[PDB]
Design a protein around this ligand. Sequence first.
Ligand SMILES: O=C(NCCC1=CCCCC1)Nc1ccc2nnsc2c1
Ligand SMILES: O=C(NCCC1=CCCCC1)Nc1ccc2nnsc2c1
Ligand SMILES: [Cl-]
Ligand SMILES: [Cl-]
Lengths: 299, 299
Amino acid sequence: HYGIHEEMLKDKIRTESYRDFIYQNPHIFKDKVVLDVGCGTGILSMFAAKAGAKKVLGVDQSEILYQAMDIIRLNKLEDTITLIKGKIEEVHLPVEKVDVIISEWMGYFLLFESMLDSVLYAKNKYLAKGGSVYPDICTISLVAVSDVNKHADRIAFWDDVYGFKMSCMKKAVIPEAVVEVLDPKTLISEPCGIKHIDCHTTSISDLEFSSDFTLKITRTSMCTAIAGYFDIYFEKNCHNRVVFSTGPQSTKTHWKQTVFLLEKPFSVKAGEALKGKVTVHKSLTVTLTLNNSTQTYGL
Amino acid sequence: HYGIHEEMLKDKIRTESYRDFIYQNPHIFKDKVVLDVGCGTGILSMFAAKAGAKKVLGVDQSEILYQAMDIIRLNKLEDTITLIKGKIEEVHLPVEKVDVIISEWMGYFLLFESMLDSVLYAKNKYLAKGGSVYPDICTISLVAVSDVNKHADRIAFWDDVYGFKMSCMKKAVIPEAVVEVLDPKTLISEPCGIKHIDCHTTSISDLEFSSDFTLKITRTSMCTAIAGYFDIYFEKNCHNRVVFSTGPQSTKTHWKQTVFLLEKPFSVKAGEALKGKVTVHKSLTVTLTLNNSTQTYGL
Ligand SMILES: O=C(NCCC1=CCCCC1)Nc1ccc2nnsc2c1
Ligand SMILES: O=C(NCCC1=CCCCC1)Nc1ccc2nnsc2c1
Ligand SMILES: [Cl-]
Ligand SMILES: [Cl-]
């Protein structure tokens, strides 16, 4: 329980990105009313207070909120930061509107078990006209993978299990998306963006989407999986823009990467433009069409 | 879901120990009626069938049981192995008694989220007079740990989190037992057994227990945690006895080791006989007294 919060705090890419955004753009926070959606320990609320926020409201539905109360007091910030326990759609705030919303809401593959729905609710109910939401821009990308040894470990493995056939288990493991840090040497295409979200204009219905994609193959090889990741941007009104990626060419984060195993690996050639389609539906499911096969995956 | 079953199958120490016990002691199974409690994919049932079982009954409450049905058919064992979906305390078996019970029921620190309760129920309701249950003997042990760097990572960490005090979080993380493979070089005492279970005579009430223990300190150092693990024995009527340990001096298993962090590390000296007390209560909790401090931990 508390160990999870510890893990997110120790994710430097995640936490230092938010810290850098806030501290390097204090003009965004100076004398502003800030709402921190799903505040956890309160760390983002304290960053905002340090950057000069007039008032910060930290909301969380979990028992961690009681720790946050004690944390805020230990740091002598109780006159700036007010904490409220509950869902953002149910709680009563002591203001009508806020100037800025900040939140670390992101799930695996951006949208699995994410709090984006609550952030958008907060944006629609509470954001002042001309206010801002951060991080403001997110993208999701796909990339092709060749890893014949790992595929054999997950799939061919079932053909002989201590002397017994277990082939039918292949059908059970294929639909399970995997969250894992990938060796960047196993990537065999350029990444392809499949989704762009601006939190200022995105609605809840935009989170169910379809995209035709094209993977520019960079290595002649057997394609055994498709991997997904996301990038997070702090852009609007920033003098110091901040970006981080959760892809395999970047420093690992707790989001790792998301892997969709192909039931039937197929050969590709460098220079090939590999076309497919992806759809994300509400727990989320991901439907992939590639090489004339379709499979739906879940996390 | 299915990935978990895959992980348990790929745990060689676990799965090969059961395989070796059954295959190297086929006299235990020859022409016998066998009950496999929580059969998963059915692998233990198929081992027993291969060793010459007259009849095997595999029971599991999970959807994996449907995969097991298909697996048993792929291996042409349906005339020997019958699978039944449900809790052992609710299902109807096609026999009054069985000759042998086998089960992989073990949890972290032996007893967290274990199926031992169901195994003992099966033993009491269904085991023929003079029948046998395997594995038949289990022990739990404690060992002292020195790891000042890891302790600092978990505890002192909270004193300064990106410039802010979070000291109160120490109290939240201490009670959370950790499941992790330990570096055997960090062990600073001889192990001490705190519990011995023979499945033939153990009752459910025996699983809540207390033990005074003595740790024979082997290195002058700062003791920062107490670690727990368990050993599993296949003994009764065996010509080829089989043992495995889940301790840090042995090949890692999926059970890893269980770690109870000390809030206040304290110095110990080689040759010291360090005395403490441990009690396990029904989710399980573990109460430790050591160096005049008491703490209750959970998983
Ligand atoms: O499937 C995993 N990891 C899951 C590991 C696991 C091990 C034991 C049971 C539970 C799940 N990774 C993975 C990465 C890149 C790949 N490229 N082509 S196939 C493929 C696979
Ligand atoms: O506490 C862990 N592992 C938990 C790692 C974690 C990291 C980030 C948040 C979630 C939990 N191990 C550990 C082993 C031996 C030890 N000996 N003295 S203290 C101590 C500690
Ligand atoms: Cl290849
Ligand atoms: Cl030391």
